[PDB]
RNA sequence: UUGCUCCACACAAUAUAGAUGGAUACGAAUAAGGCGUCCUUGUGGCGUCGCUGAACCAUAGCAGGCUAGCAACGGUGCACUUGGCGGAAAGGCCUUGGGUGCUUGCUGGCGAAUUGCAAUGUCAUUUUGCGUGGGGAUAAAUCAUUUGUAUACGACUUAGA
């Protein structure tokens, strides 16, 4: 859906043994808070030996974007699963936030290499704060200077279902 | 990946002029005029200095940029064929029956006429399309010039007359015969 | 809100058409649709003109006068494009359709009439530009229709005709426009612009 | 004689580029593009009218013929100063295209008695322009 | 005058129906003009009458009427659904019908 | 045994796939156009418009009455009338002249009630019949007989004041 990033906090449940465990964080691109535990617990499984049952979660905070109206370029790393194996890719994407960001990615992964969310994952989303380090070219085409373009035929869509003169598509 | 400008130039010399209403090309030179409709293109055009027009296509795919550059290509020889022409000089080859090739008149249209190509009775009339000026060459032997502003013209009309004369059921590394161009260039080269 | 709607078929899609036709006919609106040979299809035409020979082929085997009727007129094929979206064994399919004629040109009941279009079909509004199409005209003379250039002639002389009525209403509505240019700036002509007329 | 190509211009999207907002909750007002994301999708501003700083797509917005100077990226500050600046509320104001979409909220808030009104004054000068329609 | 038109044109559409079920007791009624639930919502609990002609005059007219009223919005273009006293008999898919300003709540 | 057709209105019957202000006429392109203006008339220059018909036209009066006047010499209906044009299914479009009626372009006078607080509240066009009174024209086909270029029978092809 469109997405919201959160960080999850959570640890191993303490022990006489050992007591404060070493809290371990992450961040998270889901839905809801429940999809996010989800996803956090999915990943300390296959990074840690730890579960749901044998942790627990301290904290979960919705990560705002500082500014989210300047326009950014992300390098994101990504794994993903194809019907013959496992791959991965860096993509980089011209946009405002990581939330889009990220929701642009899942579509066009869903697009170009039919990747599902059960397929794909984020290894991570990194802001490139120098450009000439972009060095894919449909980002590196909308960074020229002075840039401008036209939007050549222009489609008004009616709402009437007859029309009295021969639509124009100049703009 | 949806180029969102490409574009490419033509330069236009002094003596031509260049009318482009909405893809309707119209070339007027020396050697005379000659037009194109490129209503299937789907491209831009922009008069730059009356010696420069600059062709352009916007969130443009790789088929789209391609035919860009052919557009270009097109309009120059265009230019090139409406100030020094185009010619194509094509030789005929025979081992044993010498090729008869004339100019006959059926309704006026100055049908090209091929005779004893490998010895056979039929004779082998090619129609010649307008603008297009034959003349068979003398110092050489076995030779014959097109001549015409219209590259597609010219070109297709040896191409015709290449293709009407191909040997069959027989081992054509061996009969070799036929008329093929042996050379195409302008009217006015090294102008 | 008209009674009967004229629907000039140039650079139209046929099923999109259709389906726009289909639903008014069984609305209750009486539609008549023009021009159906200058009507569009998406794809190519030797992809349509594959088509219509693979639905031609089709017949009954013992009968050949009983099967599926391959009409070649451009009206026709539009007619059978829209009896397949309207439920025509019907008694409601059937009153829906008499409420429908096709015609290729404009017949002089219609010539001096008013035509429509539906900019949900367009060709120019709908395929991206690069995308190829066909013109049902030449497809139907291609597969058999006879009529294509007569239509082509009766045309001209309807244009020639159009165009030297629109002479005319060019005259006189800029004579309409000189007069109440004139007749602005009046103290009722501001009185109707300050209550938005 | 000199060559002749139809320029056939239209409406280029740049920074600096006003549009008006078709749809959403803004839905009619004004906004600059003060950058271009990508090939479909513009960062808007549009301070003075209310409308808040925001990515939206291309096919939301229609863009204006009107253009004033801007830097990329420019904050809301700055467009609203040389917004004020360049003037383009009241440029706006007198296209016919404002004056069309004024005329037709003003004919959306008439009344009956005030439709009754127009259309005796319609017919008063319905009248003098048919008596003027015969002498030329 | 040349109108004497106090109400607003409709067509009677069709049944309330699944894709193989009808179901009489509700027609659906396309009100012209409007094209959303919002618009729509002004016209609900609004009279319905449609006009018919019978060659048996009953009681001094040969012009008979079935009434009905506005119920709810269907769909997202500003059909509504409409119930009658007894409903409406089926040849009428595609009848004009008169829907009338009263119940005003102006 | 006075039949048939057309025209006028007079009354009946018959229905309606569904009036309830107006189907309101260029063509072509859409990576281009429309309109206005100007010239050296073009694939011309300049200006302007679109971004929806939410338009334009019509629209006040007893379901639209009876009257008076002012201003213009227009607008519109009806019945004529002159001259054209239209053959794709033309059956319609334009125009001349006069007559007659209305005019809400403007100012006045009188009337409406009681259908009782709503009840489509009835005003359309489709066909047929019967009457009047005014024109207009006064046939064929089939069976039977016959033919044989035809034929199971029908049918077909012929002939017969």
Not at chain 1, 135 to 153: A, C, E, I, N, S
Not at chain 4, 35 to 47: F, H, M, R, S
Request: net charge positive; hydrophobic share 40%; with cysteine.
């Amino acid at each position: 859906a469109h997405f919201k990033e959160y960080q999850v906090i959570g640890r191993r449940l303490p022990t006489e043994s050992v007591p404060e465990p070493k809290l371990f964080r992450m961040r998270i691109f889901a839905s809801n808070e429940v999809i996010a535990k989800s996803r956090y617990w999915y990943f300390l499984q296959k990074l840690h030996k730890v579960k749901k049952a044998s942790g627990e979660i301290v904290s979960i905070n919705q990560i705002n974007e500082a500014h989210p109206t300047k326009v950014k370029n992300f390098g994101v790393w990504v794994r993903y699963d194809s019907r013959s194996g496992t791959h991965n890719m860096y993509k980089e994407i011209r946009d405002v936030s990581r939330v889009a960001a990220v929701e642009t990615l899942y579509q066009d992964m869903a697009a170009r290499h039919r990747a599902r969310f059960r397929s794909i994952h984020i290894l991570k989303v990194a802001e490139i704060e120098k450009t000439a380090d972009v060095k894919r070219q449909y980002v590196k085409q909308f960074l020229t200077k002075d840039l401008k373009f036209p939007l050549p035929h222009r489609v008004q869509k009616s709402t009437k279902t007859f029309s009295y003169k021969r639509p124009s598509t100049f703009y | 990946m949806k180029y969102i400008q490409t574009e490419q130039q033509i330069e236009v010399p002094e003596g031509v002029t260049v009318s482009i209403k909405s893809r309707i090309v119209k070339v007027v030179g020396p050697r005379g005029t000659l037009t194109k409709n490129l209503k299937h293109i789907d491209v831009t055009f922009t008069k730059v200095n009356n010696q420069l027009i600059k062709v352009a296509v916007h969130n443009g795919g790789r088929k789209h940029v391609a035919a860009l550059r052919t557009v270009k290509s097109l309009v120059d020889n265009m230019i090139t064929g409406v100030t020094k022409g185009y010619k194509y000089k094509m030789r005929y080859v025979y081992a044993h029956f010498p090729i008869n090739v004339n100019i006959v008149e059926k309704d006026g249209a100055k049908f090209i006429e091929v005779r004893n190509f490998l010895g056979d009775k039929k004779i082998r009339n090619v129609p010649v399309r307008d603008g297009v000026t034959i003349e068979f060459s003398t110092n050489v032997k076995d030779e014959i010039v097109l001549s015409g502003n219209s590259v597609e013209d010219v070109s297709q009309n040896a191409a015709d007359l290449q293709q009407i004369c191909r040997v069959r059921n027989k081992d054509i590394r061996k009969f070799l015969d036929g008329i093929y161009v042996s050379h195409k260039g302008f009217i006015t080269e090294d102008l | 809100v008209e009674p009967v709607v004229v629907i000039d078929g140039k650079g139209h899609l046929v099923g999109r058409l259709a389906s726009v036709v289909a639903k008014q006919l069984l609305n209750g609106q009486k539609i008549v649709v023009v021009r159906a040979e200058e009507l569009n299809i998406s794809g190519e035409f030797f992809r349509n003109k594959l088509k219509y020979h693979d639905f031609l082929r089709k017949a009954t085997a013992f009968n050949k006068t009983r099967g599926p009727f391959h009409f070649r007129a451009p009206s026709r094929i539009f007619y059978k494009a829209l009896r397949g979206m309207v439920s025509h064994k019907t008694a409601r399919g059937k009153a829906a359709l008499e409420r429908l004629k096709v015609f290729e040109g404009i017949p002089p009941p219609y010539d001096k009439k008013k035509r429509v279009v539906v900019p949900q079909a367009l060709r120019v509004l709908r395929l991206k530009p690069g995308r190829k199409y066909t013109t049902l005209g030449k497809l139907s003379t291609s597969v058999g229709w006879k009529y294509e250039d007569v239509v082509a002639k009766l045309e001209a002389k309807r244009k020639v005709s159009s165009a030297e009525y629109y002479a005319k209403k060019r005259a006189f509505t800029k004579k309409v426009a000189s007069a109440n240019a004139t007749a602005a700036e009046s103290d009722v002509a501001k009185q109707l612009a300050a209550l938005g007329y | 004689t000199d060559s002749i190509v139809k320029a056939s211009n239209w409406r280029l999207v740049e920074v600096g580029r006003v549009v008006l907002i078709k749809k959403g909750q803004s839905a009619g007002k004004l906004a600059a593009i003060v950058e271009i994301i990508d090939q479909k999708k513009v960062l808007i501003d549009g301070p003075k009218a209310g409308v808040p700083r925001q990515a939206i797509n291309l096919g939301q917005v229609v863009l204006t013929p009107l253009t004033f100077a801007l830097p990329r990226g420019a904050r809301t500050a700055t467009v609203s100063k040389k917004w004020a600046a360049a003037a383009v509320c009241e440029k706006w104001a007198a296209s016919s295209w404002a004056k069309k979409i004024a005329q037709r909220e003003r004919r959306a808030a008439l009344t009956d008695f005030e439709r009754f009104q127009v259309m005796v004054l319609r017919k008063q000068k319905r009248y003098t322009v048919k008596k003027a329609l015969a002498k030329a | 005058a040349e109108s004497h038109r106090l109400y607003v044109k409709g067509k009677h559409l069709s049944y309330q129906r699944s894709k193989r079920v009808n179901n009489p007791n509700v027609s659906l009624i396309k009100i012209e003009g409007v094209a959303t639930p919002q618009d729509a919502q002004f016209y609900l609990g609004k009279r319905i009458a449609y006009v018919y002609r019978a060659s048996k005059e009953v009681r001094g007219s040969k012009i008979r009427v079935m009434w009905g009223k506005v119920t709810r919005t269907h769909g997202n273009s500003g059909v509504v659904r409409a119930t009658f006293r007894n409903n409406l008999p089926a040849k009428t898919f595609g009848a004009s019908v008169r829907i009338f300003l009263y119940p005003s709540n102006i």
